Amino acid sequence: KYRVRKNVLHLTDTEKRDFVRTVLILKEKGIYDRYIAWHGAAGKFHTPPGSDRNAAHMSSAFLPWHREYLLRFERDLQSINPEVTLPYWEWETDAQMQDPSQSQIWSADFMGGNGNPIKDFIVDTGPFAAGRWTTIDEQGNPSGGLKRNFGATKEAPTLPTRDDVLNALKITQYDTPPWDMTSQNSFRNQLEGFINGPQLHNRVHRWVGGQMGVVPTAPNDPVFFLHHANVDRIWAVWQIIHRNQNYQPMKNGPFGQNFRDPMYPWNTTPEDVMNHRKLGYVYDIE
């Protein structure tokens, strides 16, 4: 109820400087890479083997996993500077723009810009520019630069809209059998983006392009966290009507996707993280 997580657009210049700076410190120490690795790792962890589900995606644990991810990340930032929290990127209002790429989130003082065509869409503005920020590939090897290409795909030329959000927010069930990319009338599946894909979360990933467009590489872009903070906030909002909806499945689901199963690669359960307040942070507006 203490750490206040803010809209990237309500941050002061000081808050921006200090968040970027903390992020770079984590990078330099070597801790930022644990997160790329963790996310890649859970990606190839099938629940169960022979299945389309993995620990972080395409199943119920998708949300509590990323919540857990983000908590650990914020707490690492904290160890550096106890003032800094995680901002969220409200992409749905950026959807209202003529050119969403002109959002202040992509200023050189913050995330930096879209990839440069002349340079194969490598990001060359901001602090996370090539030369300033090392990327890691799927094998855990240096890849040579952050890439971005806003709206380059045919499936994801635009961002989710406010109306897409209100629409997921109407779903009353958290998730439904079989607990996968096929689940219908599922808030989890709808938020994730598979119902008439790609929507919301998935659409945003696809819209950014670069590493962000590929599962094993997405957390090479620090805006991965900004995006997953908006996702986590929307889940918070859904849970603002009461309560956690027994987070299906409670039981009898695949191991690692039940209320009290450990979420690889950690020992943390979904229940462990169902209430964000208990975790120690709150969203602005709350």
Ligand X SMILES: OCCc1ccc(O)cc1
Contact 159, 204 (CB under 8 A): yes
**Looking up tokens 């590489």, which residue turns up?**
217
Beta-strand runs (E) in 85-143: none
Any known ligand binding at 92? yes
Q: Which stretch binds ligand X (CB under 6 A): 162-170, 197-205, 233-241, 270-278?
A: 197-205
Quick check: 41 binds ligand X (CB under 6 A)?
A: no
Subset of residues 51 to 70 that bind ligand X, contact rule: CB under 6 A: 57
**Residue 206's binding partner, choosing from a second copy, ligand X, none, with beta-carbon cut-off 5 to 8 A by kind?**
ligand X
Interface mask toward ligand X for 156-195; x: CB under 6 A? ----------------------------------------
Q: How far is the CB of 251 from ligand X (least distance, A)?
A: 26
Is 227 a known ligand-binding residue?
Answer: no
Report how far Cα 50 is from the mean position of its chain's Cα atoms.
26
Q: How far apart are CA 113 and CA 141, in angstroms?
A: 24
Token pair for 188: 């989890």
94, 206 in Cβ contact below 8 A?
Answer: no
Tokens encoding 221: 């872009």
Nearer to ligand X, 84 or 180 (CB): 180
| Cβ atoms within 10 Å of 18's Cβ, excluding its own | 17
Residues 123-162 close enough to bind a second copy by CB under 8 A:
134, 136, 139-142
Q: Does residue 38 touch a second copy according to CB under 8 A?
A: yes
Please give the Cα distance from 181 to 88 (Å, whole number): 25
Task: Locate the DSSP E strands across 52-197.
Answer: none
**Residue 260 to residues 30, 48, 180, 246: CA-CA distances in angstroms?**
31, 16, 18, 11
Q: Does 37 bind a second copy (CB under 8 A)?
A: yes
- What span, in angstroms and rounded, lies between the C-alpha atoms of 213 and 203? 9
Of 207 and 259, nearer to ligand X (C-beta) is 207
76 labeled part of a ligand binding site? no
- For ligand X, the binding residues (CB under 6 A) are 39, 57, 198, 202, 205-206, 212-215, 218
- For a second copy, the binding residues (CB under 8 A) are 29-31, 33-34, 37-38, 40-41, 44-50, 54, 134, 136, 139-142, 254-256, 262, 264-265
- Binding site, by residue number, is 10, 13, 39, 46, 52, 57, 66, 68, 92, 109, 120, 163, 201, 205, 228, 242, 276-277, 284
